[PDB]
Write an enzyme that holds these catalytic residues in place. Structure first.
Site, mmCIF file in Angstrom:
data_model
loop_
_atom_site.group_PDB
_atom_site.id
_atom_site.type_symbol
_atom_site.label_atom_id
_atom_site.label_comp_id
_atom_site.label_asym_id
_atom_site.label_seq_id
_atom_site.Cartn_x
_atom_site.Cartn_y
_atom_site.Cartn_z
ATOM 1 N N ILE A 175 0.846 -1.193 0.000
ATOM 2 C CA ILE A 175 0.000 0.000 0.000
ATOM 3 C C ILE A 175 0.879 1.241 0.000
ATOM 4 O O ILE A 175 0.614 2.206 -0.684
ATOM 5 C CB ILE A 175 -0.862 0.023 1.300
ATOM 6 C CG1 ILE A 175 -2.018 -0.978 1.200
ATOM 7 C CG2 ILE A 175 -1.362 1.424 1.661
ATOM 8 C CD1 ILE A 175 -2.525 -1.211 -0.214
ATOM 9 N N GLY A 176 1.908 1.234 0.824
ATOM 10 C CA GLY A 176 2.903 2.274 0.771
ATOM 11 C C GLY A 176 4.124 1.822 1.526
ATOM 12 O O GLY A 176 4.229 0.656 1.908
ATOM 13 N N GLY A 211 6.699 3.196 4.891
ATOM 14 C CA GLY A 211 6.976 4.140 5.945
ATOM 15 C C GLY A 211 8.427 4.511 5.720
ATOM 16 O O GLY A 211 8.924 4.445 4.596
ATOM 17 N N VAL A 265 3.974 -1.218 4.142
ATOM 18 C CA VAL A 265 2.656 -1.450 4.701
ATOM 19 C C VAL A 265 1.844 -2.231 3.664
ATOM 20 O O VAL A 265 1.712 -1.803 2.516
ATOM 21 C CB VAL A 265 1.963 -0.115 5.046
ATOM 22 C CG1 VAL A 265 0.574 -0.340 5.621
ATOM 23 C CG2 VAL A 265 2.816 0.638 6.051
ATOM 24 N N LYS A 299 2.118 -4.005 8.888
ATOM 25 C CA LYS A 299 3.342 -3.275 8.739
ATOM 26 C C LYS A 299 4.395 -4.320 8.861
ATOM 27 O O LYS A 299 4.367 -5.059 9.821
ATOM 28 C CB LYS A 299 3.459 -2.235 9.840
ATOM 29 C CG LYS A 299 4.541 -1.199 9.597
ATOM 30 C CD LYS A 299 4.408 -0.056 10.586
ATOM 31 C CE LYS A 299 4.907 1.265 10.012
ATOM 32 N NZ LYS A 299 4.520 2.376 10.935
ATOM 33 N N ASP A 310 7.676 11.995 16.049
ATOM 34 C CA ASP A 310 7.542 12.069 14.592
ATOM 35 C C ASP A 310 6.149 12.556 14.161
ATOM 36 O O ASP A 310 5.599 12.086 13.164
ATOM 37 C CB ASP A 310 7.865 10.739 13.908
ATOM 38 C CG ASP A 310 8.288 10.913 12.463
ATOM 39 O OD1 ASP A 310 8.451 12.072 12.027
ATOM 40 O OD2 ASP A 310 8.457 9.893 11.763
ATOM 41 N N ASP A 316 2.192 5.560 13.444
ATOM 42 C CA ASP A 316 3.629 5.665 13.208
ATOM 43 C C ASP A 316 4.285 5.899 14.569
ATOM 44 O O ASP A 316 4.876 6.961 14.849
ATOM 45 C CB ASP A 316 4.014 6.749 12.166
ATOM 46 C CG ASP A 316 3.540 6.415 10.724
ATOM 47 O OD1 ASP A 316 3.481 5.228 10.352
ATOM 48 O OD2 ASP A 316 3.232 7.357 9.947
ATOM 49 N N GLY A 361 6.920 4.270 15.679
ATOM 50 C CA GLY A 361 8.255 3.692 15.688
ATOM 51 C C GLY A 361 9.364 4.515 16.313
ATOM 52 O O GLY A 361 10.389 3.958 16.750
#
EC number: 2.7.11.1
Lengths: 176, 291
Positions: B29-30, B32, B37, B52, B142, B160, B162
């Site tokens: 999907i994209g 990070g 993801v 993820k 972030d 997000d 992380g």
């Protein structure tokens, strides 16, 4: 682009050793004083690769006029001392910081404490007690750094590689 | 070598075994900044979840992977994307979480000016989260529009996780240079020790995104921007004649260089501006499928 680092501090401080520890992940078994050595590694930051030109100089007194010929266009300096040599720590203020200030004023510099593994060493803590002296603490060092007027204070063991990368990580940040 | 020690630590912390056992149809999907993801399908219900995946060997700081598990697991909140489960798959950490069909706020802000009702809704949702995290000494680190995600029904979740760190009576500030350049607080770039306040600064940047479409100094390359943030006065909005005192005054509380004078999450919760916040429905027009 290139980053030009220049490493300074008293002899023995193990300036040579610091560099090699990081670059090659090996410690030099033999102590040898540096005249002048030039090591070039490559660092990638955010996917952008940068040639890091490291300048190992002489911590000796003999090369006061031969060493600073290495300084034109220095993007950053490491100013180094052994945390177990209050003399070398004193010579930060006295010799080193002044020297680089003049040649390169707008140029940044980090304060660096070395051989921090030898703090709790009894025999080195014995050697110092025999001249009624002791190991330099971070509380101390980080007052000097703020005052002198560095980017920050950092500290590391070339041997254990504790805190090592970070020094070089912060220098880069400082340079760029 | 240290790999093995780390992979082992992780195994003990995650839920055992593999989720390919109950999920079909993994599709990216994209990305990070830490890993891809995917979307995936629960075989027995046909329900959609997101996943993820993060390789351990590709992390600049492996340790940070422990927050992916600890955060979702312990800081379950209405405005925090729900992690259902986590797993080790060979050399990859796989976290299975809810699927946010609305997408991210980044898409909405680069394509449309949101009105203050919709904005206030957003900041409300995020500050409800950050109050609760900071209450436990957890800094996200972030915060930017990319880190905010939406449901179909207009609801808003932070994610997000992380880059998060923890502070406490014992270790009260942090020092790592962490985050995305443009959203970074001035003290963090300046390399001083810092606490949760860094998040509030970054939220102030995200308000600027919501209003003016991108962060300050977007055109510059990051490292030039970092310098300007550090060296300069707090950025101001570009057109104040259009912005209400409520919001301008709100934002003047986020973007304060001195952290000690900068507002806390709980302080901001009580701020007149956030009382303009529209219902979740008021957002749904902003989503792409609707425009």
């Amino acid at each position: 682009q290139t980053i030009k680092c220049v490493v300074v501090g008293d002899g023995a401080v193990g300036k040579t050793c610091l560099l090699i520890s990081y670059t090659t992940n090996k410690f030099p078994s033999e102590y040898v004083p540096t005249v002048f050595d030039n090591y070039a590694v490559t660092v990638m930051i955010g996917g952008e690769p940068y040639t890091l030109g490291l300048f190992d100089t002489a911590g000796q007194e003999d090369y006061d006029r031969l060493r600073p010929l290495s300084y034109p266009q220095t993007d950053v300096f490491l100013v180094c001392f052994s945390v177990v040599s209050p003399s070398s720590f004193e010579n930060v203020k006295e010799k080193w910081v002044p020297e680089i200030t003049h040649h390169c004023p707008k140029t940044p510099f980090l304060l660096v404490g070395t051989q921090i593994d030898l703090r709790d060493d009894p025999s080195t803590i014995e050697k110092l007690a025999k001249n009624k002296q002791k190991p330099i603490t971070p509380e101390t060092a980080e007052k000097l750094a703020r005052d002198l007027k560095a980017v920050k204070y950092v500290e590391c063991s070339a041997l254990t590689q504790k805190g090592l990368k970070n020094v070089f990580d912060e220098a880069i940040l400082a340079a760029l | 070598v240290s790999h093995e020690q780390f992979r082992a630590a992780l195994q003990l912390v995650v839920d055992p075994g593999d989720p390919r056992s109950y999920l079909d149809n993994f599709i990216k999907i994209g990305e990070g900044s830490t890993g891809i993801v995917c979307i995936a399908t629960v075989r027995s219900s046909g329900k959609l979840v997101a996943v993820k995946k993060m390789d351990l060997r590709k992390q600049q700081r492996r340790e940070l992977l422990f927050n992916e598990v600890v955060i979702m697991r312990d800081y379950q909140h209405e405005n925090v994307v729900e992690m259902y489960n986590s797993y080790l798959v060979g050399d990859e950490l796989w976290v299975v979480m809810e699927f946010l069909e609305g997408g991210a706020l980044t898409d909405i802000v680069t394509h449309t000016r949101m009105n203050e009702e919709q904005i206030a809704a957003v900041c409300l949702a995020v500050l409800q989260a950050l109050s609760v995290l900071h209450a436990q000494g957890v800094i996200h680190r972030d915060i930017k529009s990319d880190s905010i995600l939406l449901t179909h029904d207009g609801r808003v979740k932070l994610s997000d996780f992380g880059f998060c760190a923890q502070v406490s009576k014992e270790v009260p500030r942090r020092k790592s240079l962490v985050g995305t350049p443009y959203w970074m607080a001035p003290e963090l770039i300046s390399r001083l020790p810092y606490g949760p306040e860094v998040d509030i600064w970054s939220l102030g940047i995200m308000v600027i995104e919501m209003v003016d479409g991108e962060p300050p100094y977007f055109n510059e390359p990051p490292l030039k921007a970092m310098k300007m943030i550090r060296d300069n006065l707090p950025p101001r909005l570009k057109n104040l004649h259009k912005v209400s005192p409520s919001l301008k005054g709100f934002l003047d509380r986020l973007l304060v260089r001195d952290p000690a004078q900068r507002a806390t999450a709980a302080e901001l919760l009580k701020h007149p501006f956030l009382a303009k916040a529209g219902p979740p429905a008021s957002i749904v027009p902003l989503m792409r499928q609707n425009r």
